[PDB]
Amino acid sequence: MIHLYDAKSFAKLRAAQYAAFHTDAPGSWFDHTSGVLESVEDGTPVLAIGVESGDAIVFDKNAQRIVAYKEKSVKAEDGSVSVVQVENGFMKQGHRGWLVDLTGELVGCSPVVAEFGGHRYASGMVIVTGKGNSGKTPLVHALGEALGGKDKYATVRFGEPLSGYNTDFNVFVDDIARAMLQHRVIVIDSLKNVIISRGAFDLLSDIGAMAASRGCVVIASLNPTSNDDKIVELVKEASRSNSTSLVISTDVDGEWQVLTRTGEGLARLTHTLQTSYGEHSVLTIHTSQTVIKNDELESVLR
Amino acid sequence: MIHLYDAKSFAKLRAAQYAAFHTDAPGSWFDHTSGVLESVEDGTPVLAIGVESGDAIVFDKNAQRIVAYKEKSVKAEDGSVSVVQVENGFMKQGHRGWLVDLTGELVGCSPVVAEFGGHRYASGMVIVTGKGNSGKTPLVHALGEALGGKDKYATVRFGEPLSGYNTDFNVFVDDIARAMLQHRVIVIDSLKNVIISRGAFDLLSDIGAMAASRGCVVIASLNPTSNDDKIVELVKEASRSNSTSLVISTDVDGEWQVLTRTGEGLARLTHTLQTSYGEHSVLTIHTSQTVIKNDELESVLRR
Amino acid sequence: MIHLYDAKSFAKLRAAQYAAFHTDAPGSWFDHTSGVLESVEDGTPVLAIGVESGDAIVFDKNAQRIVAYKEKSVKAEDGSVSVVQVENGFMKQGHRGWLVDLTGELVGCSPVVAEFGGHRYASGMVIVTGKGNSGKTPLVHALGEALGGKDKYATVRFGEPLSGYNTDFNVFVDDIARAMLQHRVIVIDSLKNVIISRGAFDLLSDIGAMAASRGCVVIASLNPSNDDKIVELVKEASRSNSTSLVISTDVDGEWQVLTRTGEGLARLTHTLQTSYGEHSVLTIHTSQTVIKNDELESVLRR
Amino acid sequence: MIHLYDAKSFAKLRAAQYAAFHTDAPGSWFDHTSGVLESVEDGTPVLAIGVESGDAIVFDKNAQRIVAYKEKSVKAEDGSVSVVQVENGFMKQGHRGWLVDLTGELVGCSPVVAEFGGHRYASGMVIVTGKGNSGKTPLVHALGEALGGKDKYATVRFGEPLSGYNTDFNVFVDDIARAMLQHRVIVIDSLKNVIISRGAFDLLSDIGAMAASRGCVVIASLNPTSNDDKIVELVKEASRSNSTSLVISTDVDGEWQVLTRTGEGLARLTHTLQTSYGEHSVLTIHTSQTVIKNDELESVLR
Amino acid sequence: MIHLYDAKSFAKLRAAQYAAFHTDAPGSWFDHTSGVLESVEDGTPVLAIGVESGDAIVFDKNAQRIVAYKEKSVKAEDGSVSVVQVENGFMKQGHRGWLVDLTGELVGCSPVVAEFGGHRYASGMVIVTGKGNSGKTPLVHALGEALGGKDKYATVRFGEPLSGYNTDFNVFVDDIARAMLQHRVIVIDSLKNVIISRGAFDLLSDIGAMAASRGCVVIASLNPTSNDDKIVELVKEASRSNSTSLVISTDVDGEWQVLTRTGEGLARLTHTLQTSYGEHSVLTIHTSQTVIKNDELESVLRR
Amino acid sequence: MIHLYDAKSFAKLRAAQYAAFHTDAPGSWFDHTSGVLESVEDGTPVLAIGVESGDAIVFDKNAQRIVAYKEKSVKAEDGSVSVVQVENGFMKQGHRGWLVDLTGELVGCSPVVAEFGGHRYASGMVIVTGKGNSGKTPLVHALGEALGGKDKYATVRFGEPLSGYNTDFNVFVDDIARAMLQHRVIVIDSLKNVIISRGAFDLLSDIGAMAASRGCVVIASLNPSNDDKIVELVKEASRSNSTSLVISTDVDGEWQVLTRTGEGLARLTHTLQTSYGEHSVLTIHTSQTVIKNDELESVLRR
Ligand SMILES: Nc1ncnc2c1ncn2[C@@H]1O[C@H](COP(=O)(O)CP(=O)(O)OP(=O)(O)O)[C@@H](O)[C@H]1O
Ligand SMILES: Nc1ncnc2c1ncn2[C@@H]1O[C@H](COP(=O)(O)CP(=O)(O)OP(=O)(O)O)[C@@H](O)[C@H]1O
Ligand SMILES: Nc1ncnc2c1ncn2[C@@H]1O[C@H](COP(=O)(O)CP(=O)(O)OP(=O)(O)O)[C@@H](O)[C@H]1O
Ligand SMILES: Nc1ncnc2c1ncn2[C@@H]1O[C@H](COP(=O)(O)CP(=O)(O)OP(=O)(O)O)[C@@H](O)[C@H]1O
Ligand SMILES: Nc1ncnc2c1ncn2[C@@H]1O[C@H](COP(=O)(O)CP(=O)(O)OP(=O)(O)O)[C@@H](O)[C@H]1O
Ligand SMILES: Nc1ncnc2c1ncn2[C@@H]1O[C@H](COP(=O)(O)CP(=O)(O)OP(=O)(O)O)[C@@H](O)[C@H]1O
């Protein structure tokens, strides 16, 4: 819905947005939204996500896909009406994203998902990428472990010529839906095959906001291997604007720069990570706030 | 409809167009068109806007979407007939835009929406853009507040990987329709995701005229930072010709140039704004008439 | 239909074409075709024009749109049959353009629409364009007034972010149809939004011939963007879709008018001076040379 | 159909092909094929041509369009079966082109259509084109007159912003069909608007063979005005390979080079024309065999 | 179907493939496959080829097109099932190409179609092409005559602005189907108009294998004289990989180089031809074994 | 399905992935998955693969295509539901790939398919490619023989102008399905014709994972044309759609083998020598080092 503001209520929102990342307890937003999801009546649609064609499939609070749901209308606070109808497995009426209000008056946040090694990490989508020798798959799994902390992290596998990997996009979004409904920390290997169908475009534009509204983090690897002007700019756009955070490799092997958006038109934060390998190529991130401007960001985006 | 003119009636129109921006009371056009909207019979379609596919959804005066409306014909002054029919939520007959006459004989106006810091601002669409370090989201909200004045301004959120943001285009146009039906000052964050489907193209071409006819201002942020020849020229065209005003960043951080179209084939006006940040990144525009030619405009249009 | 010629009847046509522009009374062709239109039986289709999709809508002599019309066949002089049928608002059978013969044996003309300041102006489409500081919207309205003379000129508004402007292409062609059925002098602001759907392409290719056959003039502004696809389409429309061309020059206020006088005839050029009065109203100052194709192509660069 | 050959019967064909251009009486082939057309039973389809969509409309021997025709099968000499069926104005079964055998065993010819000023001219399509100041519309009409000789030549008008011009492609092909069924010499002004829909592509590939099989000549003007690599190469291909002859302007104003294909894999012939203008821009070709190689042809094709 | 191999049975195949070109009697494969075709039951589909749309039309052993054929299933040796069904003139089930096994265990062959002037020529598709002054149409007819020897060669005409030429693609493939069902030596003039619809793409990819499996040769002219990067690379690909042999003109007028694939991953053979013209432009090839590497091939492929 | 991990269970997986390539008995994974396939109930769908259109055909354990199969739902361990339905030969519900779990908890492996000449070879897809004089078809057959060892290898033929070759894509995928259901070592000649329809794109993205999950190896030849669109698609398929890469070098007869050993594991390189015998039969001469991404990208240029 839309929101009305004056000087006073806008200052309150900016202060609440600041708190969502800087002062709130790591993972609290996730716990809150779980409660919201739990309070929903049984079989009521909570989430819809786009399939390859651009149609959308719909899920309830138990990550069960809904085949049939009679049309129902909900009048929101602003006066706008939300209609939802599902027929033969697909959304007849409604929109893509959260079909129930997870956020209320609190929007444009970057809720804090976890803290690790003296740094706070944002929910939403984190894109792991860059050129050079530093490996992306070992990094996503190490971050997934670290930010999961006490909790296990979920791995969604997609589009690699290795054993057990799904290559069907429609199963991919079904995995992603379920992961976001049930887990705070999610890893995606890999995002290469989506980078084009309507579903693939829908996902790039939908997932960061879906994740941020849930308070979960989706950590996807994206190898920018191609030299093609069409596809390489789509990697830059997804890295710059479709993602909530960006983890990118550097000149020095093992080293990475993390770029975090802290909220709606707020300062973007940067820090550096050191890493090293153990047995069977398991990566560990070494444990032991500065802002970045847009000219620094565009320089890094190469 | 079409309008017939001679030397005498054309001079009258140019003089009335001048008044709409230069002399009329800020926000008066908006108040007028509200009255017009209020006088419409209940459930009668007043506005239609295009969805992703290029179909269109339709609304009444209370920003309520219309599912069913029997075909009805209205004979305008020029002799042209307007037909409107809605079936299963979508427009079967009719056009995109205002389905009732908000403007009458007064066309090509650029109605003054507000005054702030010694400068008058136009209704229609304002595109906020440019390259460099100066931030666009803090600027749209500051302008939204300033031009709202005594009134609150409405925020439509779209296509950012942050909490509570809608990313479905069909909900976006539903938010925009409602905002324009009910508020003088509107902010859009952000216009990146529309910049391509028929709906997205329809919106770029429809919104400025919709806004200007209502006497409300839509203030949209558009980051041009990507470097593809296809998409960058579409940002220039939208900035040059789809927008009623243009707010663009400069070399000096915090500083912006405002370029305003004052009316149908009238002089384009430029002025400069200074800004600074307060607590939690809230931007304030500092408080305390010159024309710009097309070669100056094209020079500025490079970013 | 098709026309058969020998040396003698071809010389007659060239002489009649010469007269249509050079010697006939300004506006006489328009008056003639009005009479033709008036003589048509009531509700009989006279004009069809293409909508966004490439379908076409149809009108009668009173600029009223026709929803239903039973199939009817007309055998022309050459033996060719013209069939017209309208169903549910759209043309089922027939063609785009004038559905009744306005021209007879007299074709490839550039009928003279008006005279002003010692120069004759052609009916058909006039494209107003060029780069630099000289303004196009003030010029189309000044020309519209001047060529209207004793008569008012009709303004069709399209695709500008200003109050009261239509942005729906289907209403645009409905305005244009009506203007051409009822007025000698027509202004279009602006042609930028058509410059792509089938309707938009149909209009660029249809309007000059529609106008020239009626003996009315359509004066459209077209601001010429730096994309190779779109810029060449502006050159083609300026070179070959238009009957006349009005283009700005180095000196502010000054314009060159390039007029096609008929089917494979000499193209004529002259110069205009202009200045502004109050509320930005433009006046054209009151007080025959041919142009070759190498001069034309030189001028066509902007 | 297909044709079987040995050394002896192939030499006979080459000798008969030589005769079709070099020794046969000008216009004889046209007279022959008229007789063939006349001998066909009434209402039997003789010609089908493609409309904008790629569907095709069909005609009988009197250039009357056929709405309905029951499926009929004809067993040719080679054993191949030709099926023709027309329903609701369009071809349900059959092919584009001549639906009856005009040529028999005699194929790959360039039948001589006329003789004028000491030179023989081929039937098929003649494309008139080139850059520079020499005008194309005056030239097509002068050639149309000259090659028509005792007979009038037919003019098909298409896609110019002048009075009486059709701009609907479906009417254009209906005019062309009729012209070819009833006249030896045909002029087309202009071919710019086809140069893209399936019909337009079909026409470029169909018309030369249709014309050559009838023994009529279609003389089309094509202004190569565009500077676009996509469209300019399509003008070169149409000029090189879709046309039977090529008339192209030169450096010297008034002067043209005619390039004629004399038959299936035969020598291409070149000659030069002088021209000048009279009253109301009527062009006269001045009255008072050499082969061209492929490297000379490609040089000229610029 | 698929084929299983070990070292021993693979060596046998390579030796049999060698024989198909090098030692077998010229035209013997064609005679064999005729016998196979003759043994088929009446009206049973033997060949399907793609039309402009990508649908396919089907023929029997007498080159008669089939309108109706009830679904029938055939279990091959490998266990795979071939289903064929024709309805309303078009293939409802089945594939493009030979609908009956012409080849059995002997695959990847390159069967010898004829011998002329001390050189053996392969069945399959021969593309005649190149730039310069040497003419392609006189060459295809001369080769057609020479390789036909005692037998007449069939000419399929397509897409030239000359008398009696078909320009409809659907008739073209009907001519080609019939020619391949009934003749060892076939000429196509010209392949320019296919060089894009699904049928045209299907044909480029289907014809060489169809011809090679029959043991007939299709000799097509392809003028590459146009200069567009999209279309010129498609001429190179068709010349390099869609054709079984390649005949290409050289610097010296009248002279041509023939490049022959002798079999599945075997050595490619090159030789040179001299030619001259007689009466009414009839070309004669003058009468009285070396391998070419891929770098030599790619060098030659530039035109 | 998705998999949950902590530090401990992730280390176990990496150790199991290491074993799948490095320590497990060559071909053991293939033998296991055969057993799995054998245990399936008769006529139950086990594999679906995409046809030219993007629809998919489905097979059972005996490589017999399924025309009809009533909708059936299977609840997996993670809670996700797999639905399969086949109607009129095509998949109505379900996904592309293995329709039964071949891999369980063990995913992202590169199961060892064979050992030959002191080196271990991975299942999945091996792309054989490169520029220069070294021949690809003789190499795929030599590798097919060598890795087959005691077992015969299956050859799928596609898109060459030679006798007995299929050129229909729908038969190609039917051959591939069957080969993978029944054989450990598979050769494909050739992959040029797929390199574009939805099926062709689906296959490039599906085959490596299908093969790796089965524990069979598909060895395809791909000759790399000088078009920027198509050449980058060859690089992407070589870099990321394939499990291993065999590429020719400067020295004739010599090849470099690049092997992915598992999910985000070290890529291994070794060199092969070859020579020809009689009738062009190639023999690979009988008698671990890692490669970095900058070395890989250097090699990827051809
Ligand atoms: N023990 C070890 N020591 C150093 N580097 C290692 C390692 N194990 C794995 N890596 C690194 O991890 C990389 C593999 O991860 P990525 O960079 O994501 C490419 P990928 O995922 O294997 O395939 P892709 O290119 O298709 O995505 C290897 O190239 C290697 O540099
Ligand atoms: N306290 C502060 N001081 C200086 N600049 C600030 C600030 N708070 C916010 N900003 C500026 O606000 C900008 C954020 O808005 P923008 O960059 O214009 C659009 P966005 O929110 O980054 O979406 P995008 O990344 O998809 O473009 C930053 O570039 C930053 O420079
Ligand atoms: N009084 C005045 N003095 C000088 N120039 C004037 C003027 N009034 C108007 N103009 C010129 O006329 C121009 C307006 O017409 P145009 O620019 O050609 C159409 P536009 O308003 O830019 O809409 P567009 O987006 O379709 O181009 C202005 O740029 C201005 O320079
Ligand atoms: N009396 C005369 N003397 C010399 N040249 C003349 C002439 N009358 C006509 N022409 C020539 O004929 C030309 C017109 O024919 P074309 O070259 O075919 C262009 P067009 O047909 O007028 O428009 P197009 O460019 O849309 O096809 C003029 O440009 C002029 O050069
Ligand atoms: N008597 C003769 N002497 C020399 N060359 C001859 C000849 N007769 C014919 N030719 C050659 O045969 C060629 C004609 O065939 P090609 O050019 O290869 C295909 P085409 O018939 O021209 O169709 P295209 O123009 O669509 O390519 C001419 O280029 C010409 O050089
Ligand atoms: N006895 C031999 N000695 C040397 N080289 C041989 C040979 N036998 C075969 N070759 C080489 O192997 C190559 C054949 O395999 P490739 O070229 O890689 C596939 P192709 O036959 O060109 O079909 P393609 O069109 O799919 O590329 C020949 O170019 C040849 O150089």
TrEMBL record, chains B, E:
Keywords: ATP-binding, Metal-binding, Nucleotide-binding
InterPro entries: P-loop_NTPase (IPR027417), Packaging_enz_P4 (IPR020973)
Residues reported to bind UTP: 136-137, 192, 277, 281, 294
Binding of ATP 2, residues: 136-137, 277, 281
Keyword ATP-binding part of the UniProt annotation: yes
Domain of life: Viruses
Residues at which Mg(2+) 1 binds: 137
Chain residues that bind ADP 1: 133-137, 223, 268, 277, 281
Residues that bind Mg(2+) 2: 137, 160, 189
Binding-site positions, Mg(2+) 3: 137, 189
Annotated signal peptide: none
Name by which UniProt lists this protein: NTPase P4
Source organism per UniProt: Pseudomonas phage phi12
Gene: 4
